[PDB]
């Protein structure tokens, strides 16, 4: 048998919902009970990088995540692979003498290696950027003839939030109304330049509490929370329309009202679940109080917050001057562990990190030390991209096994 | 002018809602948006003791709470005084030569002194037992001809939860539907003997966070929480009927499902408020996790929890053997501050306090020290009573001023 190896490497950003996805109506096709809207983040310290490879000499589909092999046996990987394979087409690399016929893909096995630049015990959705990257890279590999919105639908079957990482900027996942899920897809609302002033600051919060997974948790809520249905039918459709308008016109005050309140309502549904799900901790509450105080002592709002399925705070600053104030604010309230290199305790961006009483005004009181593990600054970012520089591939170009 | 002094002293227990009151439809008459149901606790370490006095020589209405004079100027005191005075009748103490004509009450001023046996910075509703006691004692003083249910309605105007402390046992506050509030009253569901097996354990949790008041908080929720209306119209009416049946038939499993879930849903509405209200802290969550684990590792439920407008946990044990296990459980997970007299760290009851691996089974892991300030054990209790023993009066029988 032949031993050529075709591979593709892609880099895919993560995203952060400002109007939240919580609860499915279909556990197999992954269709949600409401729309959601998110912001794609800049790749640095947040993206997932993935290399996919096909060879007639691979005996098995196999996958590696951050160095360790893992199972593709599960339904989420099995459904993406199946859907993308079924759309594979003729490929031909003439320089290398390789012709793959459409039918060949029914038997060619795949090797996938993937790397998450978010620290793994830090707590950010690895799944979102990850299934989006897999789908996007495989779609290049197999010459699938489909736009990002249709590819959205495949990524969605690996993880619901993954479908929103196929575009940059601000992205809407439409819940769709067809049974087959074909219209449950993401679409870009605006690109990453429309609102380039926003700066994002993630507080990765210390906690050893292991968090109920988003998939199980939201299933539990659909099954036991008597408030979720009312959220889904009567609250979120309206919030979707207001958030669209707020993004269109960069109304940061409307954007702040919506983001904070939809995050809080999502955590309210989690508390109304039986047994209750507690994703925020006392540090989380302390960050919200800081943000709400800071905004009251500045009249018009300067900072929004949102929280996913954990205590990590995501803060969104109206612009860079706010970001610089806030970052000194946050360092006062969340001083580090003793002997801590500030190069390690505040990742991202560079210019803002390199940069005071009038701030003590807006925050008030200092906290105990080390409630925060570290901060990450970022920005709205573009969508996924292919990497042509093979130095960045994670599979060996000849063995098809992890470097 | 004359200088006789007529006084009455009464002792009134506090109560604990298992189906929660949260939100008014009338801020003046204090009418709620849903029914509520509570359990009256045994008086020890929980009651409020009040002495009321009238004399022609008092120039002013005045009141003392735990030693300190306070203002009666506010609407809550002004509305109770006004309502009870308007129902005053002819009084006559023949031994002392005192005749009070109905009309005299329009001019006689009152002295009130009151004492809360809950520590004041501990965090229990002083208001509930307090306005109930005031109304109950004044109703005796002024010879009002009204049953506890009608007196309920007056206490309600001092504090909504106060109306439920006019009966022992399990008590329902009916939301009523008349504009004048006359049918918004409490009624006893069963007395304190019907379910005498229940043991109650209150964890008074350490926290310096000052809590948003119940009155302001629930106003904020009515104004900003989009889930509250659905709770009030569609969740609670059904829970009221199930909780009635569960109390009637001492179904502790149904009672546990309802109590935990209605407490959690109340805190969910608080989180859905803008700005959010956080009454539970990380200690609170740790107690819920202990209770949920303990119940799973015992099959049928043995312990219910509920939380009011603060982090204090109220636990309700199916019976005394459970209570004794749990209390050793709680001491393992919440060890005291160093050098702490266990006579001070666990109040109440006596027999159960005086009373182990097989329990390590049900709780798991130990916590840091001093997360709990102290525990209080109690039981379902009777309603308010008059004290005839003048040694217990808080006003001096001749000056009408605080001892
Ligand atoms: C709380 C959220 O982050 C939900 C994340 O859900 P997942 O995308 O992880 O769930 P599955 O579809 O089961 O894979 C809010 C959001 O991203 O919208
Ligand atoms: C959370 C609760 O304890 C509400 C207490 O409310 P208050 O009775 O204190 O409020 P006001 O009527 O304004 O005086 C739940 C309950 O007791 O039902």
PDB file of C-alpha atoms in Angstrom, chain A residues 209 224 226-227 230-231 234-235 239 261 264-265 267-269 271-276 278 280-283 285 288-289 292 296 305, chain B residues 209 224 226-227 230-231 234-235 239 261 264-265 267-269 271-276 278 280-283 285 288-289 292 296 305:
ATOM      1  CA  UNK A 209     -14.338  22.769  42.577  1.00  0.00           C
ATOM      2  CA  UNK A 224     -35.806  20.355  35.958  1.00  0.00           C
ATOM      3  CA  UNK A 226     -39.243  25.621  35.573  1.00  0.00           C
ATOM      4  CA  UNK A 227     -37.871  29.075  34.536  1.00  0.00           C
ATOM      5  CA  UNK A 230     -39.939  31.135  29.868  1.00  0.00           C
ATOM      6  CA  UNK A 231     -36.429  32.410  29.303  1.00  0.00           C
ATOM      7  CA  UNK A 234     -40.156  35.073  26.096  1.00  0.00           C
ATOM      8  CA  UNK A 235     -36.843  36.635  27.139  1.00  0.00           C
ATOM      9  CA  UNK A 239     -32.710  40.205  23.737  1.00  0.00           C
ATOM     10  CA  UNK A 261     -28.349  40.514  32.503  1.00  0.00           C
ATOM     11  CA  UNK A 264     -26.955  36.574  35.287  1.00  0.00           C
ATOM     12  CA  UNK A 265     -30.149  35.010  34.006  1.00  0.00           C
ATOM     13  CA  UNK A 267     -26.728  31.534  36.169  1.00  0.00           C
ATOM     14  CA  UNK A 268     -30.228  31.989  37.594  1.00  0.00           C
ATOM     15  CA  UNK A 269     -31.459  29.068  35.495  1.00  0.00           C
ATOM     16  CA  UNK A 271     -29.602  27.781  40.369  1.00  0.00           C
ATOM     17  CA  UNK A 272     -33.203  26.865  39.538  1.00  0.00           C
ATOM     18  CA  UNK A 273     -31.969  23.468  38.344  1.00  0.00           C
ATOM     19  CA  UNK A 274     -32.441  20.432  40.519  1.00  0.00           C
ATOM     20  CA  UNK A 275     -29.837  19.781  41.920  1.00  0.00           C
ATOM     21  CA  UNK A 276     -28.660  23.395  41.572  1.00  0.00           C
ATOM     22  CA  UNK A 278     -23.212  26.805  40.995  1.00  0.00           C
ATOM     23  CA  UNK A 280     -19.888  31.352  39.974  1.00  0.00           C
ATOM     24  CA  UNK A 281     -18.065  31.546  43.287  1.00  0.00           C
ATOM     25  CA  UNK A 282     -17.393  34.353  45.763  1.00  0.00           C
ATOM     26  CA  UNK A 283     -14.571  35.707  43.603  1.00  0.00           C
ATOM     27  CA  UNK A 285     -19.456  37.875  42.807  1.00  0.00           C
ATOM     28  CA  UNK A 288     -19.406  41.710  39.472  1.00  0.00           C
ATOM     29  CA  UNK A 289     -19.592  44.049  42.442  1.00  0.00           C
ATOM     30  CA  UNK A 292     -21.227  47.474  39.013  1.00  0.00           C
ATOM     31  CA  UNK A 296     -22.094  53.663  38.832  1.00  0.00           C
ATOM     32  CA  UNK A 305     -19.207  41.227  32.378  1.00  0.00           C
TER      33      UNK A 305
ATOM     34  CA  UNK B 209     -20.978  41.333  53.464  1.00  0.00           C
ATOM     35  CA  UNK B 224     -36.196  44.159  37.003  1.00  0.00           C
ATOM     36  CA  UNK B 226     -38.115  38.954  34.018  1.00  0.00           C
ATOM     37  CA  UNK B 227     -38.512  35.489  35.668  1.00  0.00           C
ATOM     38  CA  UNK B 230     -43.647  33.510  35.804  1.00  0.00           C
ATOM     39  CA  UNK B 231     -42.658  32.184  39.200  1.00  0.00           C
ATOM     40  CA  UNK B 234     -47.204  29.615  37.201  1.00  0.00           C
ATOM     41  CA  UNK B 235     -44.856  27.989  39.720  1.00  0.00           C
ATOM     42  CA  UNK B 239     -46.192  24.388  44.882  1.00  0.00           C
ATOM     43  CA  UNK B 261     -36.408  23.920  45.015  1.00  0.00           C
ATOM     44  CA  UNK B 264     -33.232  27.808  45.107  1.00  0.00           C
ATOM     45  CA  UNK B 265     -35.743  29.436  42.798  1.00  0.00           C
ATOM     46  CA  UNK B 267     -32.257  32.835  44.981  1.00  0.00           C
ATOM     47  CA  UNK B 268     -32.494  32.422  41.204  1.00  0.00           C
ATOM     48  CA  UNK B 269     -34.872  35.383  41.033  1.00  0.00           C
ATOM     49  CA  UNK B 271     -29.654  36.590  40.610  1.00  0.00           C
ATOM     50  CA  UNK B 272     -31.947  37.572  37.733  1.00  0.00           C
ATOM     51  CA  UNK B 273     -32.435  40.961  39.397  1.00  0.00           C
ATOM     52  CA  UNK B 274     -30.629  43.982  38.060  1.00  0.00           C
ATOM     53  CA  UNK B 275     -28.229  44.577  39.808  1.00  0.00           C
ATOM     54  CA  UNK B 276     -28.092  40.948  40.983  1.00  0.00           C
ATOM     55  CA  UNK B 278     -26.310  37.456  46.109  1.00  0.00           C
ATOM     56  CA  UNK B 280     -25.865  32.867  49.500  1.00  0.00           C
ATOM     57  CA  UNK B 281     -22.093  32.610  49.708  1.00  0.00           C
ATOM     58  CA  UNK B 282     -19.615  29.768  49.214  1.00  0.00           C
ATOM     59  CA  UNK B 283     -20.363  28.390  52.678  1.00  0.00           C
ATOM     60  CA  UNK B 285     -23.229  26.310  48.598  1.00  0.00           C
ATOM     61  CA  UNK B 288     -26.276  22.508  50.048  1.00  0.00           C
ATOM     62  CA  UNK B 289     -23.717  20.143  48.571  1.00  0.00           C
ATOM     63  CA  UNK B 292     -27.570  16.780  48.546  1.00  0.00           C
ATOM     64  CA  UNK B 296     -28.208  10.607  47.781  1.00  0.00           C
ATOM     65  CA  UNK B 305     -32.576  23.060  53.303  1.00  0.00           C
TER      66      UNK B 305
END
